[PDB]
Design a protein around this ligand. Structure first.
Ligand code: NA
Length: 129
């Protein structure tokens, strides 16, 4: 599923992401735009053999199991495929663990490089929230 911008903002807000670990909602929408283009089925293979899954491109080295990332963890206790669903519940709940890992949203390289320090409120402009 490819979310509309405000459609995603709404779903993220309902799942408690607005100011989760102090990151306002626009951060998460920004991250999702550059990570997945709002597409829940996005995947990317990493050079270390791990794979990123879903709307927030969550990685198999630590957070989900795909059975093909040797020596990896599954700290969100989910199959990575769950991160590709049209329902973003699994992605949001896993993201909450990632962002609590110590480095905040810097865990997402795209957020650090393209959202951090920008006017992220623009990503929820026009949205009925
Ligand atoms: Na990415």
């Amino acid at each position: 599923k490819v979310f509309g911008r405000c459609e995603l903002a709404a779903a993220m807000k309902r799942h408690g992401l607005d100011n989760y670990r102090g990151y306002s909602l626009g951060n998460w929408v920004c991250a999702a735009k550059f990570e997945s283009n709002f597409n829940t089925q996005a995947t990317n293979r990493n050079t270390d053999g791990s794979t990123d899954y879903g709307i927030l491109q969550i990685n198999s080295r630590w957070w989900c199991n795909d059975g093909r990332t040797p020596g990896s963890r599954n700290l969100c206790n989910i199959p990575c495929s769950a991160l590709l669903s049209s329902d973003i519940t699994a992605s949001v709940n896993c993201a909450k663990k990632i962002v609590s890992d110590g480095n905040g949203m810097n865990a997402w390289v795209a957020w650090r490089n393209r959202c951090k320090g920008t006017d992220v409120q623009a990503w929820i402009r026009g949205c009925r929230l």
